[PDB]
Design a protein around this motif. Sequence first.
Motif, PDB file in Angstrom:
ATOM      1  N   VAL A  86     -23.155 -16.610  51.581  1.00 51.74           N
ATOM      2  CA  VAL A  86     -22.198 -15.517  51.841  1.00 51.74           C
ATOM      3  C   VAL A  86     -21.155 -15.557  51.558  1.00 51.74           C
ATOM      4  CG1 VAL A  86     -23.932 -15.966  54.075  1.00 51.74           C
ATOM      5  CG2 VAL A  86     -21.773 -17.872  53.774  1.00 51.74           C
ATOM      6  N   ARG A  87     -20.484 -14.753  51.843  1.00 53.62           N
ATOM      7  CA  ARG A  87     -18.890 -14.749  50.937  1.00 53.62           C
ATOM      8  C   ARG A  87     -17.745 -14.326  52.307  1.00 53.62           C
ATOM      9  NH1 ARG A  87     -18.720 -11.433  46.505  1.00 53.62           N
ATOM     10  NH2 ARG A  87     -19.719  -9.587  47.451  1.00 53.62           N
ATOM     11  N   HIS A  88     -16.970 -15.930  52.527  1.00 56.88           N
ATOM     12  CA  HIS A  88     -16.154 -15.383  53.213  1.00 56.88           C
ATOM     13  C   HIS A  88     -15.139 -14.124  53.336  1.00 56.88           C
ATOM     14  CE1 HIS A  88     -12.444 -17.053  55.829  1.00 56.88           C
ATOM     15  NE2 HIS A  88     -13.045 -17.503  56.741  1.00 56.88           N
ATOM     16  N   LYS A  89     -14.409 -13.542  53.506  1.00 58.80           N
ATOM     17  CA  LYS A  89     -13.698 -12.464  53.836  1.00 58.80           C
ATOM     18  C   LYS A  89     -12.377 -12.184  53.452  1.00 58.80           C
ATOM     19  CE  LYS A  89     -17.041 -10.403  57.920  1.00 58.80           C
ATOM     20  NZ  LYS A  89     -18.094  -8.707  57.756  1.00 58.80           N
ATOM     21  N   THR A  91     -10.766 -15.106  52.163  1.00 63.50           N
ATOM     22  CA  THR A  91     -10.653 -16.034  50.919  1.00 63.50           C
ATOM     23  C   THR A  91     -11.384 -15.603  50.088  1.00 63.50           C
ATOM     24  OG1 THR A  91     -12.628 -17.889  51.769  1.00 63.50           O
ATOM     25  CG2 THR A  91     -10.429 -18.354  52.000  1.00 63.50           C
ATOM     26  N   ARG A  92     -12.183 -14.359  49.830  1.00 63.01           N
ATOM     27  CA  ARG A  92     -13.855 -14.268  48.741  1.00 63.01           C
ATOM     28  C   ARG A  92     -14.357 -15.326  48.627  1.00 63.01           C
ATOM     29  NH1 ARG A  92     -13.773  -9.011  48.073  1.00 63.01           N
ATOM     30  NH2 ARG A  92     -16.151  -9.338  48.240  1.00 63.01           N
ATOM     31  N   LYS A  93     -14.708 -16.577  48.736  1.00 67.77           N
ATOM     32  CA  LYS A  93     -15.305 -17.768  48.513  1.00 67.77           C
ATOM     33  C   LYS A  93     -16.586 -17.540  48.800  1.00 67.77           C
ATOM     34  CE  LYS A  93     -13.119 -21.236  48.969  1.00 67.77           C
ATOM     35  NZ  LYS A  93     -12.650 -22.874  48.610  1.00 67.77           N
ATOM     36  N   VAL A  94     -17.912 -18.600  47.934  1.00 71.18           N
ATOM     37  CA  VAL A  94     -18.901 -18.600  47.603  1.00 71.18           C
ATOM     38  C   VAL A  94     -19.601 -19.227  48.988  1.00 71.18           C
ATOM     39  CG1 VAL A  94     -21.336 -17.738  47.129  1.00 71.18           C
ATOM     40  CG2 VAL A  94     -20.097 -16.232  46.767  1.00 71.18           C
ATOM     41  N   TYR A  95     -20.555 -19.039  49.567  1.00 66.13           N
ATOM     42  CA  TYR A  95     -21.155 -20.803  50.565  1.00 66.13           C
ATOM     43  C   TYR A  95     -22.418 -20.107  50.806  1.00 66.13           C
ATOM     44  CZ  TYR A  95     -16.060 -21.309  51.777  1.00 66.13           C
ATOM     45  OH  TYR A  95     -15.047 -21.791  51.730  1.00 66.13           O
ATOM     46  N   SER A 354     -21.102 -13.514  36.959  1.00 65.84           N
ATOM     47  CA  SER A 354     -19.690 -13.153  38.438  1.00 65.84           C
ATOM     48  C   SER A 354     -20.191 -14.773  39.018  1.00 65.84           C
ATOM     49  CB  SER A 354     -19.397 -12.587  39.012  1.00 65.84           C
ATOM     50  OG  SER A 354     -20.665 -12.155  39.765  1.00 65.84           O
ATOM     51  N   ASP A 355     -18.903 -15.091  40.030  1.00 68.76           N
ATOM     52  CA  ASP A 355     -19.808 -16.122  41.300  1.00 68.76           C
ATOM     53  C   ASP A 355     -20.794 -15.785  42.005  1.00 68.76           C
ATOM     54  OD1 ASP A 355     -18.559 -13.941  42.585  1.00 68.76           O
ATOM     55  OD2 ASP A 355     -17.147 -14.210  43.838  1.00 68.76           O
TER      56      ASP A 355
END
Lengths: 395, 396
Positions: A86-89, A91-95, A354-355
């Motif tokens: 997933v990517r927080h919407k 924060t653009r951050k990946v989990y 990329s991330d």
Amino acid sequence: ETRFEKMDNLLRDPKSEVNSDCLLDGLDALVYDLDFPALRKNKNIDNFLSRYKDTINKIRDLRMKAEDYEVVKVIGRGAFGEVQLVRHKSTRKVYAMKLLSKFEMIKRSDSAFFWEERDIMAFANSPWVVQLFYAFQDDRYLYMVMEYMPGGDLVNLMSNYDVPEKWARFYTAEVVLALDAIHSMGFIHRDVKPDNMLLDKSGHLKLADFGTCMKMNKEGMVRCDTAVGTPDYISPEVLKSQGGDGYYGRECDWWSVGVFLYEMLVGDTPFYADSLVGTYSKIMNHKNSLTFPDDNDISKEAKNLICAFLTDREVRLGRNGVEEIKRHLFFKNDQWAWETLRDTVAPVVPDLSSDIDTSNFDDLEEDKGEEETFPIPKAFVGNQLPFVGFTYYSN
Amino acid sequence: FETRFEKMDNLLRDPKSEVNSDCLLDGLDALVYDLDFPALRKNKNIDNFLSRYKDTINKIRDLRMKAEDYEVVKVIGRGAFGEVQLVRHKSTRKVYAMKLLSKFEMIKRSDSAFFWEERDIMAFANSPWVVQLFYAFQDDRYLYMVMEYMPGGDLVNLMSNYDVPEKWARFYTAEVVLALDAIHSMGFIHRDVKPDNMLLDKSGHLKLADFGTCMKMNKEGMVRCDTAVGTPDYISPEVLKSQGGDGYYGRECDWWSVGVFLYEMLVGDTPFYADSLVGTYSKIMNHKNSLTFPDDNDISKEAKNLICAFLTDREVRLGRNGVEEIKRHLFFKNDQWAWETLRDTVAPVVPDLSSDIDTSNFDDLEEDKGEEETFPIPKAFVGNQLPFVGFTYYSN
Ligand SMILES: O=C(NCc1cccc(O)c1)Nc1nc(-c2ccncc2)cs1
């Protein structure tokens, strides 16, 4: 002292069961379980539900929810749920996010693995264990949002590479440090396979518990599934406890390493059979069923570690200590040291991009049914109760 | 400008919020109380859950504000859902008044919702014109409301012991007016304010209390309900019809009470009084005729006017265009004060007191010395606690 301090130390602090997230899970849980036409025939319930309508709509909105997160790939899928990247919407951050299904999990397989699952990743505080960043829920799923593992699982690795005893020594080693870490907390990891072995950016290995098994279409049969752990990697004692004979401990994970090491070296599982029954039978039969080809190289000592793990319980290695495990000649080299390891440079260091970089991960179905939950009660069954206080934050 | 995380953190910190820390406690306490009977524990989900939190709510119930915090002094009234008790806080030793509502009686009578505006008004009003709520809390059996003591007694006690000069009348009516406007400006209506709900403090000034019947306004400043009542004497014509289902009614219903309070201070009797429920009810609808003044009693030409103007039909009634057409009334002209200084001015009666514990300005009472009724042990889940959840409130 005069006790409004006595009180509110409970009010907010994480391991207190009255910490605010418990209280919110509480009002939220009660509400899901109250709201049903049959139950609203009770004027008390109905009226309570009316006053709390708007205010819990906002609660559901302000607390972390699944729509706070964008889904990129569904990687791996369970009996009890799934894992998505997933990517927080904002924060653009990946989990990596695990969805546990409340229904399938409370129901009749029972085995309630989630407190344990959760608590480990959140409080392990170990390089070897993947981290739980957030947990939340709704009336269908639990959600563990865990730290992301940019390399693959070891399933991907074996797919690309024939694995040298060198690498195979290295990963088994980090898995061994991962397994004591957990055991030190009194936890049985209880399902250990290449799929839960994850690699960070350093190509260093971390341990997880995920959505799982294998494959589409039932050929090269990849049968897997069932109930607990996975067919190939289970012990005779885990089989027998289902089962219903005995009870099994943390000894079961060591059996698993044995099997994992058999897979990197031989390229196949020890007990693999056409069916799952042919597999369960082989495993009880491991004494006769466990065999190697020839099988040069497969160094004498690796065949020995394997057979140390792949024996019956109380004679099996690592029952006296993880210490007994490291002494094993199979870990003998000048490359690294037991206490140094993760400092040392790893056989495979994943090529960035990329991330997002998805190549270490698959693409899946993304379809269908919103499968069953907790059939609609004509009276109050409190089905959401058992998950209260499961919401958890980063601090 | 506020991130969702914060709104929620602030949401737990606000007394005006129903999701705040104490509210969710009440909520959990509730589930424990209502979920726990051996019959219901036959369910694993419930059973497993009780055992988990059970004892830990006993940690909460002891360090919660509880009845035992308070040493009971005299009984200062009995309202048939419970009794008002003069109390001392056993620790702070500060002295308060405390109302008690039987959880059982209400549940028996339905009538479980009326105390929300009563506490809502008392806690949040922040007004010289309103009895203040310091606390609210519960245990299984009853609610509790802890209020500022109002040592001067109510107006029924005053009116009983005095012949009331129109200058005294001007004063009191005037503080009632401001008191009503305070509540109107929160958006409520008293809905039958009577001299019982008029209380006097240490210095002789006035505050409103017993707000249970208050109704929160919406759009057009109107409202209505089927609600069962008592004591029609002071109640407007439109409010009486509002049972039977006739129509809506405004805050002009409260201004009615004032012309009745005014007529009653000067006249010594209520204007519509009768020996029946019917005679009074019908005396009221018939106000155009039924309303009369004594021979023996010569009340000033603009004192009648004020009574008469409050005592008319809703649409013609003073207060309908604002509170100012009231304050601007000729009955209100005088040399001894102006609206703004009025709580800063001097009372017609200042009560002289032996203690902070003086009961001498109220009637005396003791107790039931009689049985208490239990909610039966339930078949299924019932939820008799649900309507009271969120009633806890503190002050800081
Ligand atoms: O709370 C009331 N109502 C009377 C009552 C009694 C028992 C059960 C009931 O259902 C109702 N009136 C109020 N009086 C005060 C007050 C504050 C300070 N000093 C004396 C009285 C607040 S509300």
